[PDB]
Design a protein around this ligand. Structure first.
Ligand SMILES: *[C@@]1([N]S(=O)(=O)C2=[C][C]=[C][C]=[C]2)=[C][C]=[C]N=C1C([O])=O
Ligand SMILES: [Zn+2]
Ligand SMILES: [Zn+2]
Ligand SMILES: [Zn+2]
Length: 231
């Protein structure tokens, strides 16, 4: 039932309803001969939508909005990018052109800028210290500390007990560490323990890539990060 790399042609996006007024969005990119999916979130906020992360590039992000319009038919008024890499900010100019207000932390905006990536317009304050949490309409935004990147945020939907981990959380199938060029391997497990301490009631955990699960994904990520650290 959860869409996989197979049932999604590159350039297209699938939505997956997780709970009443929570969906994931799933896209794919080709990187080094392989094809890899990517997840974002969509959270209903009254009669508008909050988008978490792009669908990894301009074409995919245009397809995502077409697919939202087609299947949900409420407007995307704001978007949050959970860190500065392309699978999170790539497509932000597309969103912006469609009248979506794009948000990230100052930390994410600086890094995107340093990186030459697209830079979300609006700044999320109050997330600069580990364990910082802020409300953003129908979600809580949480900075656990450095992990996959120094700026990574996680997103919780209090009304549905959905934790969106982004690239700080690995799917079960992933048993080796991925893109760790920008990671803080030393702090990653501590950062996951903050997530665990703050959201012990989460029922659905959505990794940045691949299949959803439960809070077991945090422990799994911990295990993989520690093994990589000891290579
Ligand atoms: C990655 N990680 S990755 O380049 O190591 C990769 C590639 C193919 C299959 C698995 C992992 C790459 C792009 C975006 N995100 C990630 C990630 O979050 O680890
Ligand atoms: Zn990343
Ligand atoms: Zn990623
Ligand atoms: Zn595991």
């Amino acid at each position: 039932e959860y869409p996989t790399v197979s049932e999604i042609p590159v350039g297209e996006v699938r939505l997956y309803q997780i709970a009443d007024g929570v969906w994931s969005h799933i896209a794919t990119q080709s990187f080094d001969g392989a094809v890899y999916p990517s997840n974002g979130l969509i959270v209903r906020d009254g009669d508008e939508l909050l988008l978490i992360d792009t669908a990894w590039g301009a074409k995919n992000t245009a397809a995502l909005l077409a697919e939202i319009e087609k299947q949900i038919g409420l407007p995307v008024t704001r978007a949050v990018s959970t860190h500065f890499h392309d699978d999170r900010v790539g497509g932000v100019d597309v969103l912006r052109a469609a009248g979506v207000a794009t948000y990230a932390s100052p930390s994410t905006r600086r890094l995107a800028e340093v990186e030459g990536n697209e830079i979300p317009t609006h700044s999320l304050e109050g997330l600069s210290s580990s364990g910082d949490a802020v409300r953003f309409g129908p979600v809580e935004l949480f900075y656990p500390g450095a992990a996959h990147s120094t700026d990574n945020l996680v997103v919780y939907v209090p009304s549905a007990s959905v934790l969106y981990g982004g690239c700080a959380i690995y799917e079960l199938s992933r048993t080796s560490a991925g893109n760790v060029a920008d990671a803080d391997l030393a702090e990653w497990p501590t950062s996951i323990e903050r997530i665990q301490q703050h959201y012990p009631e989460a029922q659905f955990v959505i990794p940045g890539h691949g299949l959803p699960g439960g809070l077991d994904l945090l422990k799994h990520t911990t295990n993989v990060v520690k093994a990589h650290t000891n290579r």
